[PDB]
Amino acid sequence: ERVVTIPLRDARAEPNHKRADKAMILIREHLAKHFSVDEDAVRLDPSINEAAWARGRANTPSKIRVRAARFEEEGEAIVEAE
Amino acid sequence: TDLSAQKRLAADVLDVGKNRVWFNPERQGDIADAITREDVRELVDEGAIQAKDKKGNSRGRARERQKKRAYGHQKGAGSRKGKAGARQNSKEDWESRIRAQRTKLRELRDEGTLSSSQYRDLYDKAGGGEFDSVADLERYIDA
Amino acid sequence: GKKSKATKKRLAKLDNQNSRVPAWVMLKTDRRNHKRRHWRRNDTDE
């Protein structure tokens, strides 16, 4: 378990009106890479969802502090905001 | 589980719109077994099926604006959009003005201040548009 | 539209004709309803 800062600047490559959707994909991709798990195994708690969608679908925050844990037999990650 | 049939029933039971009825995420299985309207009422009482509160637009910002405008502010040339006679109907203003002038003259006749001859002279002049307001009428009577 | 008593009987018959050929007829003849009418795709009388 550790606290990570996820950069969400690559969501600018995706069209403006859909930024929140890509942000949520970037978060899952980052936690899968850094915690050495599969993207299917990363569980994002609704706190992260509400954080990225806070100012709508177009105005997403450039960064996001996230607390993630790593456990189990197959290997998975439960993640939340702070 | 498909709770859409119950959503329709809960909406009729609670007498609220479908989008405002809430179902407990932990009690989905119990709401799934809810076939009848009596089963729904039982679940309403258990607190499993609730109705959200309907929004009402806040009139606070409007009330503050209504106070400034009643005091004479926020009605300058840069705030007016309609034409002059649209903001105040000229026929309605004449109705307001002339009824007020005819009531003042009727009160002064019932008081004995003006005779039926003086009244007639002033009534006909008021009907001819000689007095702007009631104060302008009183200013003519007092010489 | 407002239907009469006779129009109602006719529409009723058309609905009854819309049923399948029973399971037992398939066994009796040793192996299809050609009058299969849909409310949208097909058209009735009147």
Partner: protein, 56 residues
């Protein structure tokens, strides 16, 4: 307005209906005459020699 597709939208009038006499959907409910059997026009059934080829 086009005479094709946009003019087909106004078509919600009932004219031709099931006939009391012949059973065909040809009883014009406004004219009270059947276009198939002639019910409402004649006591005799509507039939014409041109409904078949001349030598048949």
């Amino acid at each position: 307005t086009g005479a094709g597709t946009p003019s087909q939208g106004k078509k919600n009038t009932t004219t031709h209906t099931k006939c009391r006499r012949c059973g065909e959907k040809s009883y014009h409910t406004k004219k009270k005459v059947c276009s198939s059997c002639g019910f409402g026009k004649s006591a005799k059934r509507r039939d014409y020699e041109w409904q078949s080829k001349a030598g048949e």
